[PDB]
């Protein structure tokens, strides 16, 4: 099945939202395939935020995402990339609706708690950038036949 | 007051979402008038899904809804049919928004956890098809005057 | 597996605790085998409270448990009778510890929200008294092998 | 930072939603600056609902908001006035989306549980009308740098 | 009915536990009669902690409880003083059991999140010390007859 | 500060309890220092369960803990080893009290959802056995001074 990359940013860890966030994906029916607590290197972050390499805020972005530990995750399921984004809510917490992670839990786009892959192709980039393939665990949910036909 | 029929499907029971679902209707202010745990017969299911009698997936639908027990419910209140549907979310979990039952809890339209009456008229059909009239309990909530003017 | 009878009393329904209570038994791993929303008849209640037939408060007890609808349940699992009682907490909410249903949710022994069978033998009495055998649904949880060895 | 006035109405207190509502604003990241449990006087209420002084329902509105205690609050943060309104949901619970306070918790516009300032200017009116300036507490959240850049 | 004084300490407010704590008392069935957000004066604190006036840590205690705003509450109900203490848990979070406020939410006795009156007589002292009598609101819960016989 | 090793077992992952468990440790005030999703090797498991090397069930234990992925964690705080065990509850879910992880979420000792180090010395063994020292992240909580004096 399809897979997406979700990172809980420094502010999401600091504010004690790690279990809250993981619970949303579990209760939805998505399968945890990768989980990892790290301090992302500025190099790794530079590669991650490469489409913004020439934007001005880039320097600060990489500085901040390096300022503390992140929880890197890989989740799997039908349309997990788009649905994951719906579950996170709008990138700017101000346009995020109640019920979503950014809608419920944060305020400002610079401290917006979480990242999710925006496309299947960027998902595959980011999973590959953040995880070794032997760090991705494959198993079958006991609930699979009740989640999918 | 108005009444709607809500059924928790086999996957909703299997995944342990019965208490979760009932809680959403209680905390909203709607009144439980009927509650019943059953295995719906293929006959009963055929009558329930009669507008899809000639559609192709019909056979599988009836087979699946018979594959395990369902929780049949009747809820009552102002606009409960439309609001109930809003609370369930879009029939395809993929269009369901976070905050709704299908939005929070499931992924695929074939395993979409729950059913709610789509109209007042289909509500009355379904309540009559699934419940004997002496199975419907009438009482007054202690909170009624704080729920309604 | 072992089975117990749990009834949510009129005050538990009035106070909107039905979904909350069911959720505690689901998340524990117990299997719902019977669920039923009714107004218990004074006759049925008299048989239920027969060990207190000659106690004085008996009249009031039967009057109260008839004063509104109850949710009658049958739950199944290893030691469900004793564990169900531990989950409910002490019969007097005043001795009930936080974390339990009566501990979390109620105050006075006369309005103590819930009933659970006190023994395997009284469980079998009460299941037989409150449920027709065809109202008890048998199925296998998708999670069974992860709940039991 | 910006500030808004939020009042939990008599029905919100009666239905035990005070901690629920406060939790939504805390977990969002907004800062509690004022909190106060009162019975609003008909005079105070008349000033509060002054734009509806000549509307017909006015009499009933003031009578109801006086019928029981309200929890008056002041919350602070980036765009708290508009975001607060988004968090409350539509004034008519019928147009309120799941995930929001009125969407999750109530049904009818006459018993709609909560009030929030509709503009920065009405916010400043209402804060001044409901709170003495020494009742507003200023402090710095330990989480501030993780909520704002 | 009996009344107790409960104060959420500076660390409880800082850590965003105000709504959480109030919710435990509401869902239990106790009645909020007083609610107030303040910075306790060192004088007021000295009177509050008068039995520890000659203990050494006293100076620090008063300094800390003055270091930030507290939520002062009065709650009412059958045995609310002792039950309130049971709900808070042991004063040292290390002896607090899961399910209780201190058991769930904190670690160290010096940052133990909350205060509750230890006796009916100290309750009456503290309510009188912290609240003006016109700040205490009297009303009847819609749920009273379902909480008490 | 003191550190303990906590592993969510295959049944805890299968049953969707990962976010629930992590939330209990976060909300308590403990600091996540290590997080890791893996399939434990039979060799690693043999070293982990070495005090039971000569017990008979050993073979099955290692087979089961290898049967699916586990979430390995390191948590840090005052008395985290003993408190962690209190939070998990009794090793046999049957003696576990409501409010605890095993008390709330599981039934049978063979499927008891979670592991926590039983001593400071076994904690140090297990952290060293399961984590590389560069996988343990050090940072300061924004809430530290509100958790500890």
From Swiss-Prot, chains A, B, C, D, E, F:
Keywords: ATP-binding, Cytoplasm, Differentiation, Endocytosis, Isopeptide bond, Kinase, Magnesium, Metal-binding, Neurogenesis, Nucleotide metabolism, Nucleotide-binding, Nucleus, Phosphoprotein, Transferase, Ubl conjugation
Activity regulation information from UniProt: Autophosphorylation at His-115 increases serine/threonine protein kinase activity of the enzyme. Interaction with the SET complex inhibits the endonuclease activity.
InterPro entries: NDK-like_dom, NDK-like_dom_sf, Nucleoside_diP_kinase, Nucleoside_diP_kinase_AS
Major subcellular location class: cytoplasm
Annotated phenotype, changing residue 93 to S: Increased motility of carcinoma cells
Transmembrane feature ranges: none
Swiss-Prot/TrEMBL GO biological process terms: cell differentiation; CTP biosynthetic process; endocytosis; GTP biosynthetic process; lactation; negative regulation of cell population proliferation; nervous system development; positive regulation of DNA binding
Active site: 115
Tissue-specific expression: Isoform 1 is expressed in heart, brain, placenta, lung, liver, skeletal muscle, pancreas, spleen and thymus. Expressed in lung carcinoma cell lines but not in normal lung tissues. Isoform 2 is ubiquitously expressed and its expression is also related to tumor differentiation.
Cofactors demanded by this protein: Mg(2+)
MF-aspect GO terms: 3'-5' exonuclease activity; ATP binding; DNA nuclease activity; GTP binding; identical protein binding; magnesium ion binding; nucleoside diphosphate kinase activity; ribosomal small subunit binding
Quaternary structure annotation from Swiss-Prot or TrEMBL: Hexamer of two different chains: A and B (A6, A5B, A4B2, A3B3, A2B4, AB5, B6). Interacts with PRUNE1. Component of the SET complex, composed of at least ANP32A, APEX1, HMGB2, NME1, SET and TREX1. Within this complex, interacts directly with SET. Also interacts with TREX1, but only following translocation to the nucleus.
Name recorded for this polypeptide: Nucleoside diphosphate kinase A
Gene it is expressed from: NME1
